Amino acid sequence: MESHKHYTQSETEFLLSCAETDENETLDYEEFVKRFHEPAKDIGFNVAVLLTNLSEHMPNDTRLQTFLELAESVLNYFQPFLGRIEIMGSAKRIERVYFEISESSRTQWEKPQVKESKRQFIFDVVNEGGEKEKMELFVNFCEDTIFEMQLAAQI
Amino acid sequence: AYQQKLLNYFARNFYNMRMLALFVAFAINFILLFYKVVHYVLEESSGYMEPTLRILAILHTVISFFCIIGYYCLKVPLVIFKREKEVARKLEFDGLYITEQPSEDDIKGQWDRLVINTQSFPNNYWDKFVKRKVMDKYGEFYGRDRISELLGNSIDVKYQMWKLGVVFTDNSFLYLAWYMTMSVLGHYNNFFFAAHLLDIAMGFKTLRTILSSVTHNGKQLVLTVGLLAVVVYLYTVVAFNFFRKFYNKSEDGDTPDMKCDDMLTCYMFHMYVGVRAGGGIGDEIEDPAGDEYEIYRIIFDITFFFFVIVILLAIIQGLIIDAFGELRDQQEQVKEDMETKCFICGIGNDYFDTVPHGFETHTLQEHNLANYLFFLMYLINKDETEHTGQESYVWKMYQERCWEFFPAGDCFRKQYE
Amino acid sequence: TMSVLGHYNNFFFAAHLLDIAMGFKTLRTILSSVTHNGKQLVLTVGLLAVVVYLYTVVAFNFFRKFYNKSEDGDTPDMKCDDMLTCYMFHMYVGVRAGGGIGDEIEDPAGDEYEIYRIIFDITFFFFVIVILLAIIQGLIIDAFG
Amino acid sequence: ELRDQQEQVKEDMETKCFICGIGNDYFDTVPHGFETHTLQEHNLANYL
Numbered sequence: 186m187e188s189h190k191h192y193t194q195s196e197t198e199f200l201l202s203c204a205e206t207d208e209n210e211t212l213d214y215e216e217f218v219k220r221f222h223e224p225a226k227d228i229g230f231n232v233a234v235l236l237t238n239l240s241e242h243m244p245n246d247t248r249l250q251t252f253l254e255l256a257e258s259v260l261n262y263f264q265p266f267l268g269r270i271e272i273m274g275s276a277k278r279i280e281r282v283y284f285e286i287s288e289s290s291r292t293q294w295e296k297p298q299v300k301e302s303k304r305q306f307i308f309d310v311v312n313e314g315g316e317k318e319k320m321e322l323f324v325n326f327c328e329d330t331i332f333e334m335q336l337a338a339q340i
Numbered sequence: 341a342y343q344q345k346l347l348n349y350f351a352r353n354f355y356n357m358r359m360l361a362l363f364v365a366f367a368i369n370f371i372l373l374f375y376k377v378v379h380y381v382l383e384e385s386s387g388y389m390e391p392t393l394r395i396l397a398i399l400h401t402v403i404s405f406f407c408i409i410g411y412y413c414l415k416v417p418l419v420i421f422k423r424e425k426e427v428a429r430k431l432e433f434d435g436l437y438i439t440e441q442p443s444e445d446d447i448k449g450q451w452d453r454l455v456i457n458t459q460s461f462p463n464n465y466w467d468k469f470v471k472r473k474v475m476d477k478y479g480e481f482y483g484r485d486r487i488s489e490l491l492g493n494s495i496d497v498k499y500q501m502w503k504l505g506v507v508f509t510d511n512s513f514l515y516l517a518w519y520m521t522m523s524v525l526g527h528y529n530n531f532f533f534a535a536h537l538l539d540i541a542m543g544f545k546t547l548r549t550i551l552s553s554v555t556h557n558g559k560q561l562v563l564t565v566g567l568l569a570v571v572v573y574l575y576t577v578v579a580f581n582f583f584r585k586f587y588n589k590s591e592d593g594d595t596p597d598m599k600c601d602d603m604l605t606c607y608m609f610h611m612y613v614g615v616r617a618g619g620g621i622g623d624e625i626e627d628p629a630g631d632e633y634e635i636y637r638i639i640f641d642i643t644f645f646f647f648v649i650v651i652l653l654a655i656i657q658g659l660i661i662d663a664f665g666e667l668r669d670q671q672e673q674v675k676e677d678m679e680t681k682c683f684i685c686g687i688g689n690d691y692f693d694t695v696p697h698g699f700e701t702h703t704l705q706e707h708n709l710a711n712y713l714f715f716l717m718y719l720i721n722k723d724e725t726e727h728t729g730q731e732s733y734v735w736k737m738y739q740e741r742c743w744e745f746f747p748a749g750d751c752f753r754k755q756y757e
Numbered sequence: 758t759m760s761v762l763g764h765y766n767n768f769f770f771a772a773h774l775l776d777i778a779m780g781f782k783t784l785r786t787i788l789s790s791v792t793h794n795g796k797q798l799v800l801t802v803g804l805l806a807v808v809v810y811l812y813t814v815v816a817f818n819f820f821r822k823f824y825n826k827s828e829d830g831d832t833p834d835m836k837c838d839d840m841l842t843c844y845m846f847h848m849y850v851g852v853r854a855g856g857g858i859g860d861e862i863e864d865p866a867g868d869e870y871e872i873y874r875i876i877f878d879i880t881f882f883f884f885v886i887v888i889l890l891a892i893i894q895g896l897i898i899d900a901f902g
Numbered sequence: 903e904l905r906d907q908q909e910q911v912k913e914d915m916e917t918k919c920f921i922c923g924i925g926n927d928y929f930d931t932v933p934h935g936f937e938t939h940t941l942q943e944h945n946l947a948n949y950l
């Protein structure tokens with residue numbers, strides 16, 4: 186742990202708290218990551234949305250960057266998983282939306298029976314399909330690819 | 341339990357097996373280049389050239405059979421899903437097999453009357469309560485004796501008979517059947533693996549465009565070849581009635597000299613020779629010098645060269661080259677439109693640019709139509725107890741099918757900053 | 758390194774007039790346009806060598822008796838009933854002609870295969886000389902545009 | 903020219919109003935925006 190230059194010596198000892206109680210001065214390999222990792226990746230997610238939700242909504246804040254530059258070992262871990270769209274939200278005003286993208290769905294928007302169905306669609310719509318049915322043809326496309334992404338899963 | 345192990349191997353390797361039934365079908369049509377005349381193959385490398393074709397021609401029918409089993413488990417389940425959606429959204433949101441009863445056209449509408457009598461109708465459409473929704477919406481104007489009757493080792497035989505009506509009428513499945521039914525004929529005669537190099541055409545992109553441009557401007561092309569067969573026909577009736585004495589395909593007059601004084605054989609002479617020449621018809625005709633009809637003959641040939649070889653054969657080539665100019669440019673335009681506007685906003689490369697990487701981050705993070713697809717996959721796994729304030733103004737509007745929630749013109753910088 | 762070879766043989770200073778091409782501006786543009794639309798050009802010449810190949814296998818299996826490059830029958834008459842030499846005959850002569858293949862072939866008049874032969878030649882003239890040889894010229898002239 | 907002339911005419915018919923002369927864009931702004939504007943609001947049949 187010390188040779189990776191990530192944790193300082195005030196943190197390499199805290200990580201070795203007891204961690205075994207087992208007779209050999211060792212650990213358990215996949216149980217120590219079972220103990221402590223996964224009950225802070227979805228707890229810690231909503232923290233990452235909240236610091237994201239404040240920086241984009243409230244700019245020009247000197248007080249916020251002091252936390253924000255400390256969070257960069259989190260905000261550069263969850264940015265693979267942080268899906269950000271924009272909708273016209275119920276008040277005639279456009280408000281951003283933040284959500285959670287899995288890892289069994291960023292790796293099946295690859296797998297080229299799904300990639301070929303995109304390029305067969307993008308060319309079909311930006312060529313033909315008027316403005317009274319453009320976004321209908323998008324929402325009708327998202328329903329199919331979700332069936333494709335289910336289909337490429339059980340293979 | 342071992343069947344679904346193999347059957348899920350072939351659907352995984354379908355795009356990576358169709359590049360194997362091409363590197364084989366070159367190796368057939370390279371050994372087959374050595375034939376010689378009874379037709380018997382010689383050798384150029386060694387004696388083991390004949391068995392490497394009898395090996396290679398049974399290996400090709402096997403691989404061309406695994407590329408339709410892998411098609412039957414990769415893309416034909418999807419074409420069912422896009423078909424069971426459109427039926428189920430027709431008799432429910434609109435009403436088709438109760439109120440409308442479709443016409444003699446749209447045979448797929450007529451064919452899909454066979455499916456709604458089945459037990460397991462929405463097999464792929466995730467929406468197994470259509471048959472309860474119609475009787476609650478259309479059980480009032482029409483009696484629920486009828487709607488209960490219209491809808492409803494023993495497999496879904498009335499449904500499996502419907503499904504094969506969708507697989508066989510499917511476009512890309514027929515090509516995977518014609519690709520295999522030649523490999524059955526490839527052992528009746530070895531020369532039928534020469535019609536497998538036409539998988540180059542439906543395999544590349546700038547060769548699929550040529551094969552489309554022959555028929556893309558097609559509905560005018562028949563009406564222009566159909567003017568060739570009338571101008572050359574009207575050049576027959578003049579030549580048949582006036583100029584029979586020039587039309588000799590014969591030698592010196594001593595021979596049993598062959599003529600063209602018969603309508604059906606003067607006509608095929610004017611089209612097998614009169615079109616493909618360079619000078620129209622004035623090549624393969626005895627020279628007019630000592631005749632009274634000479635001036636009436638130079639006028640006959642010049643307007644043949646001008647109407648059929650200068651005009652009508654240039655604008656038949658013109659509709660096949662300048663359809664290849666549209667279809668290449670169409671693609672170019674699509675790419676340019678993709679790299680100069682936003683898909684969902686529809687704004688421009690200019691207004692978002694205004695900063696380094698201005699349009700790039702606007703479409704990588706702020707809209708990024710991947711994300712609008714993961715967001716709709718989000719609401720399917722979220723429970724309706726858990727929908728927040730905006731994930732249920734969306735999910736109400738999507739169940740309602742209104743779609744006023746995509747950003748029409750503005751995004752974020754068009755009101756803030 | 759050609760000027761070293763220019764004294765092994767005097768004829769190697771004839772490959773120094775190709776310094777005209779990388780020397781001017783409207784001649785450097787021609788020499789670029791051959792390969793500028795190049796990645797489609799191989800896939801279109803590569804369709805010529807397959808359509809003319811599929812016109813060989815039909816002519817080899819059906820029409821061997823017309824393919825005489827010979828004189829009057831009395832001579833030791835030369836044929837094209839061998840695949841590799843029927844194929845190079847369809848490409849050295851069948852492409853560069855004006856009428857496709859209906860020039861250098863004995864005339865079909867007294868045969869039962871006559872209607873099956875006029876269809877063979879018209880679609881040779883239309884597919885390989887009217888279309889596929891116009892859109893191979895088309896990618897070298899409209900890359901210069 | 904004469905094929906393109908016809909093409910242009912068709913395109914002009916499907917992107918402007920005959921009597922207004924305004925555009926497919928300003929009337930669109932809503933689902934079926936240009937369609938109802940020329941089916942009901944002007945519709946040169948009705949002026950006849």
Ligand SMILES: Nc1ncnc2c1ncn2[C@@H]1O[C@H](COP(=O)(O)OP(=O)(O)OP(=O)(O)O)[C@@H](O)[C@H]1O
Binds near residue numbers: 679684
């Ligand atoms: N809403 C949008 N979402 C994503 N891309 C967009 C959008 N609007 C415009 N674009 C443009 O589309 C381009 C994306 O390229 P494209 O969709 O052809 O696939 P790609 O990212 O090139 O990867 P591949 O070609 O392998 O699918 C981006 O460069 C972007 O400029």
Ligand SMILES: Nc1ncnc2c1ncn2[C@@H]1O[C@H](COP(=O)(O)OP(=O)(O)OP(=O)(O)O)[C@@H](O)[C@H]1O
Binds near residue numbers: 920940
């Ligand atoms: N003032 C207008 N009145 C009617 N149509 C208009 C007007 N301005 C533009 N248009 C366009 O003209 C189109 C009408 O098509 P057109 O006039 O060619 O005949 P049609 O409705 O297609 O029927 P047909 O071709 O059988 O006569 C409409 O789609 C409309 O978009």
Ligand SMILES: Cn1c(=O)c2c(ncn2C)n(C)c1=O
Binds near residue numbers: 328331332466
């Ligand atoms: C359950 N369910 C849905 O409810 C659904 C869907 N796509 C859209 N909806 C609405 N999919 C794929 C789905 O499985």
Ligand SMILES: [Ca+2]
Binds near residue numbers: 724725727728
């Ligand atoms: Ca709630």
Ligand SMILES: [Zn+2]
Binds near residue numbers: 682683686687702751
């Ligand atoms: Zn946008």
Ligand SMILES: [Zn+2]
Binds near residue numbers: 919922
């Ligand atoms: Zn108007």
